[PDB]
Design a protein around this nucleic acid. Structure first.
Lengths: 125, 155, 106, 187, 168
RNA sequence: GUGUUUAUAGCCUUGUUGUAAUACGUCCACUGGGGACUGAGGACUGCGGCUUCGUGCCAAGGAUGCUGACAUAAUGGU
RNA sequence: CUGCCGAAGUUUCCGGAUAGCAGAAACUCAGAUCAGUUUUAUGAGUAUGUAAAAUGAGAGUUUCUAGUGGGCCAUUUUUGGUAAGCAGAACUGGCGAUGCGGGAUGAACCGAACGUGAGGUUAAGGUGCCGGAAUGUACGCUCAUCAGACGAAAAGGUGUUAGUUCA
RNA sequence: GCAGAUCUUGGUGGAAGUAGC
RNA sequence: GCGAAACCACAGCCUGGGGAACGGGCCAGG
RNA sequence: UCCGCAUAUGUAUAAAAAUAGAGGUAGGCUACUCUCCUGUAUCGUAGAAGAUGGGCGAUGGUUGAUGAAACGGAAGUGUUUUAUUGACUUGUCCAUGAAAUUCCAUGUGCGGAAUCGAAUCCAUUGCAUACGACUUUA
């Protein structure tokens, strides 16, 4: 096993209005609800259900029931931001978001560069 | 219960792989590679220990988990010292030829320490020997002579 | 040949109906890619057509079309209600329809 | 989401009722559906449960045992087979045991709404259709359970060749500077 | 959702009672109209005070002072069943008093097949001491080492191309 | 592991730091888009709004304007 | 052929005289009355009744003039019961003169009462497929080898889930 | 002013190229 | 070769249910 | 074989396997890392429906046409390997042509013959037999 519901483990919200926002579990209300919080101001401290989040592989040490400001201090100290981003999971998610933002002209450009890339076709005999 | 972990100290066996619910618990005396598909208990190889995680396990699952712990210990015991099964036979006025034959003079012919890593199989074989020596339409005192396993202990 | 098809694929599921009464004047259309009633709001008012071929080469052509428009979403899964100039035949259940991008508000 | 002309479904681990209802709706939607590995379907309930259900069915008709014929019967009951629309929809379904040569070289999809691992509670007894069929009259279980390894070995060899071939372009991808020169578009 | 209302009511003053006594209850209802009706029904069957001769003097919804702190709530309830006389006490761990009452209603309506009108709450208290916790399930939730995998994961676009990972 | 009281984490409670913010309820004779069905009536009156006043203008007692396609066709009926 | 009105289907004496229901005619009459309605308080015994308030509607008539003079579904209150069901009164409405959505199908169950259409929105029921509509969300019970979805029933459950009491 | 009256008169069917002579 | 008559609302494969037979005619299936 | 007559829109995507997880992993049976956390991906996508040329970079990717050999049995009917022969080559840079569509409407089948075989009847037969129909032999 690599993902255990634990105090301090970083989770990714996949349902609700805060979809795609990182958060860290601070307390376990029950087997169906967990108290999470994120240092960024756009994510208020709240209780979320386990079915609305996915469990990440990053564990960062927090005291039980830590307040919002101290969570941010630990988050900055343990550089969770740019640690999650280093993993290929976040890079795939960020690329998907960037690719969704491409307009028609950008899509035409991508087709041109990917054709310039594909015409490489160099393989050793 | 949220968690019902059952730690079991790992023996000196060759292998303890339990991937795909198949506990290939090999050992020096014998390779007790018995699949752990009887119960849905997560096995954690905590070094010289086997934590049988039964988190959110029911009473039936917990009973199976407890049986699995004994099975793991029995497999480790067989993988370390096996299981000798001494068998004792008593002859009546008509001796039973042994390939069982002449059972109280029976013209029909049927088919003693018994060391073995699989204690269950050795015990099952002992039961088969006892089942073979079955009296039919005979008094218990007259059929007091029979094949009964004397003792069963680790070799 | 992937330099065409300015339209979107769709399927003619059925007419609007209760358990035992059918209303052929309005048809239920499943636009592919549209998976909820909020995404069905993009295709409202768009022209939809049923394209088929008939034996006679009338007009010097082998293909004829029934035009229609998308009126409102149907249900939660992204199906829409379409009214065609001529009511779609009942034989076209499960047939293919083309949803253009005009009249465009994009 | 989107439809193809022919959809091949690998029925391994799919519940009988959940897959049949999805297939029947797709058949009525105007699609040709091929279901392979029909002997690997699962039914919720223990072995004895559906055994008595099928034994009672034998008491009742043309009793079919083959796993595809079981699945074909389940799909048919979810179709308006008394009308021309239901009959036409039925003829677009091709259910077989195993993966025949025309289909083992084609991509096979799965239905998450019918998968056992996502619908049945863990620790629930289940009865495989192929195993259930084997004792009620079906006699080709052993030969199809032997041929699958031949298909798997050939398919595994194909995947290794494809993966080895792909490694060249994958290495050549990062080799070309233009891959990262204009990778700001997310590609 | 449910809302906790505090309702204070008293009988209409008369020549016999210049000034009447004030009776206040904290009761849960989805809306204020339900709370007022439940308050009168409780008063009628506890104090034998008629609604016709009585009036509501105050009503105020109460929010949870600490909705971001996990708490254990013990609820004393009265069950009206085929027998019509039962006393039960349950303990729920959650963040608000409303959630515990909603959880209690869901539990009893499921297990015991009850209804909102039959169920009446005598008291809801907050168990602030671990020793005061009676149920074994809640005691586990207060253990120092909550450690369990994600339960009930289960995770249009039909016809997925690859098998689901449904794991870590 | 036993007991601790911020240590090299902090937790809760309490008053309390400049005030708040947000959610919910409610209201605006505040406002910006998308879709569909309808066009009854047939000079003028009327009630209103603009307008210095206007044979003035207007979304104000019910659709008009700008276009495109066809007679060997288009459109409908049986 | 179309349009409009439209019952009774039963009190009372006793084949009828009736009455009553439904129309025609002759009236007068809002500064007036009427009501399958609720009231105020006190009269009598929460019900019941009273004169004069609320709400709605303009009302009262006189004459004669067609059709009917049953039942069924039963509910409820209710008497006797009698192995137990069941039977007997009144009451209540409906069907009977009534199509439509639902109830798998359905003479009486749940909605709803009808000119020809367009659009919108619902009721009762429903949204896996047949079948129009979430293989929706959240919290629980159960695995039934005769599940469940719609007396053999007392009990037995080394079948359980939650809780209460004593502890 | 017709669809009925085991309606009246006339015409013509299936039975049937059957029972049969 | 000759040559009828009776009869005729109309079709016509079964299992269940449709309470007033429901059946053959409805509903659900084979 | 002659004669006559009637005349879908990118159709692109192949290990297996379980969740008490797998895949593959250097090294030499491992060890441990990596990946997932669906395909919103990958493959292809310019050209008056896709022109004419000058080319250039690479001196090559797509393919047509044949000559092909291998592999594929479960229902192989297709996977490649190509040998070339020609082209487009979007790889890239230029020069021409597009329009008054001046605002949407979009060999195959039948009927005849001259032919070649086969089958039935047929010489037949009871092997079959109300009759049909069947089985042998001319």
């Amino acid at each position: 096993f690599k993902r255990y519901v634990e105090v301090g483990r970083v989770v990714l919200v996949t349902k609700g209005e805060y979809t795609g926002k990182l958060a860290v579990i601070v307390d376990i209300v029950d087997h169906k609800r967990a108290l999470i919080d994120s240092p960024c101001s756009e994510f208020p401290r709240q209780v979320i259900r386990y079915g609305s989040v996915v469990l990440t592989h990053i564990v960062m040490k927090l005291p039980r029931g830590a307040r919002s400001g101290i969570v941010a201090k630990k988050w900055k100290a343990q550089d969770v931001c740019n640690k999650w981003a280093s993993s290929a999971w976040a890079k795939k998610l960020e690329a998907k978001k960037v690719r969704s933002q491409l307009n028609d002209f950008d899509r035409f450009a991508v087709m041109r560069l990917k054709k310039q890339r594909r015409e490489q076709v160099n393989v050793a005999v | 219960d949220i968690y019902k972990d059952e730690t079991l100290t790992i023996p000196k066996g060759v292998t303890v792989d339990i991937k795909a619910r198949n506990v290939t618990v090999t050992g020096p005396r014998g390779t007790l590679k018995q699949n752990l598909r009887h119960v849905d208990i997560e096995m954690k190889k905590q070094g010289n220990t086997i934590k049988f995680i039964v988190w959110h396990g029911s009473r039936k699952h917990n009973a199976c988990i407890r049986s699995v712990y004994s099975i793991i210990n029995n497999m480790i015991i067989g993988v370390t010292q096996g299981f000798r099964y001494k068998m004792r036979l008593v002859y009546a006025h008509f001796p039973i030829n042994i390939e069982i034959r002449n059972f109280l003079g029976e013209r029909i012919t049927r088919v003693i320490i018994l060391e073995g890593n699989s204690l269950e199989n050795v015990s099952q074989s002992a039961a088969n020997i006892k089942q073979i020596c079955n009296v039919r339409n005979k008094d218990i005192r007259k059929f007091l002579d029979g094949i009964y396993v004397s003792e069963r202990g680790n070799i | 040949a992937q330099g065409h098809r300015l339209y979107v694929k769709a399927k003619h599921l059925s007419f609007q109906r209760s358990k035992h009464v059918i209303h052929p004047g309005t048809s239920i259309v499943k636009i592919e890619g549209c998976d909820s009633k909020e995404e069905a709001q993009f295709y409202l008012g768009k022209r939809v057509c049923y394209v088929y071929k008939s034996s006679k080469a009338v007009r010097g052509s082998k293909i004829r079309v029934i035009w229609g428009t998308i009126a409102r979403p149907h249900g939660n899964s992204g199906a829409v209600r379409a009214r065609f100039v001529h009511n779609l035949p009942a034989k076209t259940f499960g047939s293919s329809l083309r949803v253009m991008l005009y009249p465009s508000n994009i | 989401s989107e439809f193809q002309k022919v959809v091949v479904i690998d029925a391994k681990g799919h519940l009988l009722g959940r897959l049949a209802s999805v297939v029947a709706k797709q058949l009525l939607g105007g699609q040709k559906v091929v279901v392979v590995r029909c002997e690997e379907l699962n039914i919720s309930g223990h072995f004895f449960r559906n055994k008595l259900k099928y034994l009672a069915y034998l008491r009742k008709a043309f009793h079919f045992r083959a796993p595809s014929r079981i699945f074909q019967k389940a799909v048919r009951g979810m179709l308006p087979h008394k009308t021309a629309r239901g009959q036409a929809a039925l003829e677009h379904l091709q259910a077989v045991e195993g993966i025949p040569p025309p289909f083992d070289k084609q991509k096979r999809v799965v239905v998450p709404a019918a998968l056992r691992v996502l619908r049945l509670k863990p620790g629930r007894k289940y009865c495989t259709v192929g195993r259930l069929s084997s004792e009620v009259g079906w006699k080709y279980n052993d030969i199809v359970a032997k041929l699958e390894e031949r298909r798997k070995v050939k398919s595994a060899a194909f995947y290794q060749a494809k993966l080895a071939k792909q490694k060249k372009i994958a290495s050549a991808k990062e080799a070309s500077p233009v891959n990262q020169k204009l990778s700001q578009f997310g590609y | 959702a449910l809302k906790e209302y505090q309702v204070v009511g008293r009988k209409v003053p008369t020549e016999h009672e210049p000034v009447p006594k004030l009776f206040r209850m904290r009761l849960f209802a989805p809306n204020e109209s339900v709370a007022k009706s439940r308050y009168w029904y409780f008063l009628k069957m506890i104090n034998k005070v008629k609604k016709a001769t009585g009036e509501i003097v105050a009503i105020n919804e109460i929010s949870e002072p600490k909705p971001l702190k996990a708490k254990v709530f013990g609820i004393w309830i009265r069950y009206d069943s085929r027998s019509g006389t039962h006393n039960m006490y349950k303990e729920f761990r959650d963040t608000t008093r409303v959630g515990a009452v909603e959880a209690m209603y869901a539990d009893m309506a499921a297990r015991h097949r009850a209804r909102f009108r039959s169920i009446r709450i005598l008291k809801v208290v907050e168990v602030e001491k671990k020793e005061d916790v009676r149920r074994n399930y809640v005691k586990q939730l207060l253990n120092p080492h909550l450690k369990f995998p994600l339960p009930h994961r289960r995770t249009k676009k039909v016809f997925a191309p690859h098998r689901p990972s449904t794991f870590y």
